[PDB]
From a paper:
Flavodoxins are electron transfer proteins that participate in a variety of reactions in prokaryotes and in some unicellular algae. The identification of [name] as an essential protein for [name] infectivity and the fact that [name] is not present in humans open the possibility of using it as a target for the development of novel and specific antimicrobials against [name]. According to its gene sequence translation, it contains 147 residues and very likely belongs to the so-called short-chain flavodoxins characterized by the lack of a 20-residue loop that, in the long-chain flavodoxins, appears intercalated in the fifth β-strand. Either structure shows the archetypical α/β sandwich [name] fold (5 α-helices that pack against a five-stranded β-sheet with a 21345 topology, forming an α/β/α sandwich).
To understand the molecular basis of the interaction of the FMN cofactor with the protein moiety and to provide a structural frame for the identification and characterization of SpFld inhibitors, we have solved the crystal structures of the SpFld in the apo form and in complex with FMN, at 2.18 and 1.69 Å, respectively. Overall, the holo (note that the holo form contains selenomethionine (SeMet) residues) and apo SpFld structures are similar with an r.m.s.d of 0.8 Å. The main differences between the two structures are traced to two of the three FMN binding loops encompassing residues 10–14 (phosphate loop), 57–66 (50’ loop) and 92–100 (90’ loop), the latter two sandwiching the isoalloxazine moiety. Smaller changes are observed in the phosphate binding loop upon FMN binding because, in the different apoproteins studied, this loop always carries bound anions: a phosphate anion in Sp apoflavodoxin, a chloride anion in Helicobacter pylori, or a sulfate anion in Anabaena. Accommodation of the FMN into the Sp apoprotein takes place with changes in the dihedral angles of several residues of the isoalloxazine binding loops. In the 57–66 loop, the main changes are observed in residues G60, D61, G62 and E63, while in the 92–100 loop they occur in residues D92, Y95 and D96. No significant changes are noticed in the FMN phosphate binding loop, possibly reflecting that the conformation adopted by this loop in the apoprotein is highly influenced by the phosphate anion bound, which mimics the equivalent moiety in the FMN of the holoprotein. As previously reported for the apo/holo [name] pairs in Anabaena PCC7119 and H. pylori, the entrance of the FMN cofactor makes the two isoalloxazine binding loops to move apart. In this reorganization, existing interactions between the two loops in the apoform (Y95/G60 and E97/G62) are broken and the protein expands: the holoprotein surface area is 7745 Å compared to 7135 Å for the apoprotein.
Numbering used by the authors: 0 to 146
């Protein structure tokens, strides 16, 4: 394939899963091999094997990580991912005044590992509309371009 992308997601009410899937589908159409897994089913260290690492996450309450993301975040923060390209996407809402703060938190943890951000993070309000789909597709196409 063009390269190997590993997308890890957390999703409570399905929006973030759907977003992960949109990104995965464009990457597959561009010729990459892609794995798409819920965060409870993989290890952060599996990222060592990939060329592109992506986290798709919702945000829980007052700007927290998903409960199920806490262990994955810890494991990821302890890795050295020099030479990997990353990106971060997610769904959120404004009810807790911390819209997609988990997306920002995962951007920072990736910076700390030495990986390089390949495209601007994509934050979606609740479910994806076609305008959000376009943004996600441009994100995937920019990562593909960088290889």
């Amino acid at each position: 394939g063009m390269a190997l992308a590993k997308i890890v997601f957390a999703s409570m009410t399905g929006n973030t899963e759907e977003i992960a899937d949109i990104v995965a589908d464009k990457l597959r159409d561009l010729g990459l091999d892609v794995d798409v897994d819920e965060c409870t089913t993989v290890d952060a260290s599996d990222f060592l094997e990939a060329d592109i690492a992506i986290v798709a996450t919702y945000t829980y309450g007052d700007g927290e990580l998903p409960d199920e993301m806490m262990d994955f975040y810890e494991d990821l923060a302890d890795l050295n991912l020099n030479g990997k390209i990353y990106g971060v996407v997610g769904s959120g809402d404004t009810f807790y005044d911390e819209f997609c703060k988990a997306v920002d938190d995962f951007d920072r943890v990736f910076v700390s590992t030495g990986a390089e951000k390949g495209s601007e993070c994509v934050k979606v309000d609740l479910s994806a509309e076609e305008e959000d789909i376009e943004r996600l597709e441009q994100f995937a196409e920019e990562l593909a371009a960088k290889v």
